[PDB]
């Protein structure tokens, strides 16, 4: 059992790795576009 748990922990780390990319991409792409729509669109009207 533990003999296969040695492989099992590695595969769990692989699942954790997939979660890492998915959550990280969902956050990094979301934040900067959100700031652009708010602030960069804001800057135009400040000059206006």
């Amino acid at each position: 059992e533990i003999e296969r748990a040695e492989y099992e922990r590695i595969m769990k780390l692989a699942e954790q790795q997939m979660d890492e990319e998915d959550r990280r991409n969902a956050a990094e792409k979301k934040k900067r576009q959100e700031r652009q729509a708010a602030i960069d669109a804001l800057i135009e009207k400040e000059a206006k």
Binding site: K30, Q36, A37, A38, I39, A41, L42, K45, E46, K48
Partner: protein
């Protein structure tokens, strides 16, 4: 695909609309020319090359405010046929706008609205704005709603109107127009949100360091509330909320539809750095009468239906914790026959700000809509003022001469009275 038509009446509707479209174009990121440097169908309509056109009709019997938009920076965004301006205003007279002047231009506006709806196949409802004290606002709003009732039948005709302030008033004949509009709105309107100028004036300084705001600052606060209401229809969220969802839950009876509105956190651009603005803070501060946009104390009345709409880093676990703590507040009372009384919806898109502006870069925000019997406090003042006016027949000759029959005034008075008894009967316990 899925769509809302915006209709604006009178001076306030145009000026409120101008601020809202400023927020909407920024929040999606569409340039003032309609080009770029999604859920566009919700408020934006698409044309040939890159140009976007907004799904709005601006109506006023006075061309002054409309001509400002025609000359203004946003002149290219709006299609010229959407901007309809009359010749002479209703002169703060309900009868003049209802019968004499309004009926001259009514047919043109309805055709424009109907033509717009063809491109808008995903229609779910209409949003309409009025001034209660105004003549064109309230007077033309009644005829427009009455026609639309038979034109479209079962369609959500939501409204957002400015109710007269308890003490601040800028029109002597204001009580006449409000009592006449109230009779018209209570029948056909599906659900009409209420705000007043005086509480907006108080919050614009209490919540943020602006010593002397103008109509511009007030319009931005209104636009923020409308944006959060339509935010669930525009972006992904953990709990999608549609217009029919609000319509079923908010109103328990036909004539008790009138809700109240609130928003939090409203905080200056500097103080936001001092406070965490966690989910507990934004939820707890909503129920305070200071944050109410309608100057009626909830402690006088009771709560029967509440809705929470969240935008930010909201986690569902904190929502349950926040709601549970609210129910432990002995200062807040609920009707026994409505144990739950809460619908909450979560959206991921944060609020968007505007420069030369009043708000801050709040990471998470929340919108609050509720129905309370405290609105009965406001109605009694309007009824009392009207009785003083009609006791000596203060301004009857102006309204009668414009075609309106005198027999309507007692009828509208009875309708307000029946609403007052209906609110009292509902608030009664058993």
């Amino acid at each position: 695909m899925r769509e809302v038509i915006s209709i604006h009446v009178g001076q306030a509707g145009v000026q409120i609309g101008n601020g809202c479209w400023e927020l909407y174009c920024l929040e999606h990121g569409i340039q003032p020319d309609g080009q770029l440097p999604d859920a566009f169908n919700t408020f934006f309509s698409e044309t040939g090359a890159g140009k976007h056109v907004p799904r709005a009709v601006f109506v006023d019997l006075e061309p002054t405010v409309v001509d400002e938009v025609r000359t203004g920076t946003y002149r290219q965004l709006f299609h010229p046929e959407q901007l309809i301006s009359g010749k002479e205003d209703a002169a703060n007279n309900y009868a003049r706008g209802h019968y004499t002047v309004g009926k001259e231009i009514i047919d043109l506006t309805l055709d424009r609205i109907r033509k717009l709806a063809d491109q808008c196949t995903g229609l779910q409802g209409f949003l309409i704005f009025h001034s209660f004290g105004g003549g064109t606002g309230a007077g033309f709003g009644s005829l427009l709603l009455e026609r639309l009732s038979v034109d479209y039948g079962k369609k959500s005709k939501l409204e957002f109107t400015v109710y007269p302030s308890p003490q601040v008033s800028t029109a002597i004949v204001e009580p006449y127009n409000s009592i006449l509009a109230t009779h018209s709105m209570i029948d056909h309107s599906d659900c009409a949100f209420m705000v007043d100028n005086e509480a907006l004036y108080d919050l614009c300084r209490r919540a943020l360091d602006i010593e002397r705001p103008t109509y511009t600052n007030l319009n931005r606060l209104i636009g923020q509330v409308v944006s959060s209401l339509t935010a669930s229809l525009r972006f992904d969220g953990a709990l999608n909320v549609d217009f029919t969802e609000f319509q079923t839950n908010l109103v328990p009876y036909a004539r008790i539809h009138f809700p109240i509105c609130s928003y939090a956190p409203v905080i200056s651009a500097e103080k936001a750095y001092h406070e965490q603005l966690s989910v507990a803070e934004i939820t707890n501060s909503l129920f305070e009468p200071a944050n109410m946009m309608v100057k009626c104390d909830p402690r006088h009345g009771k709560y029967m239906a509440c809705t929470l709409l969240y935008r930010g880093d909201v986690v569902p676990k904190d929502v349950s914790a926040a709601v549970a703590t609210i129910k432990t507040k002995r200062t807040i009372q609920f009707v026994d026959w409505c144990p739950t009384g809460f619908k909450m919806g979560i959206n991921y898109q944060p609020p968007t700000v505007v420069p030369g502006g009043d708000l801050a870069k709040v990471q998470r925000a929340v919108c609050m809509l509720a129905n309370t019997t405290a609105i009965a406090e406001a109605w009694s003042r309007l009824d009392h003022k009207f009785d003083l006016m009609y006791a000596k027949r203060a301004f009857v000759h102006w309204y009668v001469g414009e075609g309106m029959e005198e027999a309507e005034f007692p009828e509208a008075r009875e309708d307000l009275a029946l609403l007052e008894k209906d609110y009292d009967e509902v608030a009664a316990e058993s």
